[PDB]
UniProtKB/Swiss-Prot annotation:
Belongs to the protein kinase superfamily. AGC Ser/Thr protein kinase family. Protein kinase that acts as a blue light photoreceptor. Required for non-photochemical quenching (NPQ), a mechanism that converts and dissipates the harmful excess absorbed light energy into heat and protect the photosynthetic apparatus from photo-oxidative damage. Controls the energy-dependent chlorophyll fluorescence quenching (qE) activity of chlorophyll excited states by inducing the expression of the qE effector protein LHCSR3 in high light intensities. This is Phototropin. FMN binds at residues 40-45, 58, 73, 83, 104. Autophosphorylated in response to blue light irradiation. Residues 1-64 form the PAS domain. It comes from Chlamydomonas reinhardtii.
Length: 109
């Protein structure tokens, strides 16, 4: 299959911290668990990230909807890569959002 990475954000905490990341996520971004867990995913953004697409994810997360955007992201060493990000909300039976899950693909090609 295509090369992707996977994370889980906790939506019971107000700023959606990451609580789990696949090994490829660390290997792709250059960050380790000590710098990823407990933090919001936006640390991967930087100068060239498009604010209009960031705002697309912000709104989908507040509305508890799925969302797919492509973002410029930066590895720990500063170098950029194009991240095709799909976020999916996970609900409890009472309709509340408990977790957000994300598939991240590096589409720099
Ligand atoms: C990030 N992946 C990612 C994965 C999940 C499951 C979630 C919920 C969010 C992300 N983000 C974005 C970030 O957490 C936030 O949702 C947005 O930046 C919008 O909110 P703000 O407050 O910044 O307007 C991811 N962002 C990335 O840049 N790279 C990812 O891999």
């Amino acid at each position: 299959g295509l090369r992707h990475t996977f994370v889980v954000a906790d939506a019971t905490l107000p700023d959606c911290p990451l609580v789990y990341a696949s090994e490829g996520f660390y290997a792709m971004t250059g960050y380790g668990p000590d710098e990823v867990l407990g933090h919001n995913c936006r640390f991967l953004q930087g100068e060239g990230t498009d604010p209009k697409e960031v705002q697309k994810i912000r709104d989908a997360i507040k509305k508890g909807e799925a969302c797919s955007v492509r973002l410029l992201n930066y590895r720990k060493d500063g170098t950029p890569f194009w991240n095709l990000l799909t976020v999916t909300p996970i609900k409890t039976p009472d309709g509340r959002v408990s977790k957000f899950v994300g598939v991240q693909v590096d589409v720099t090609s």
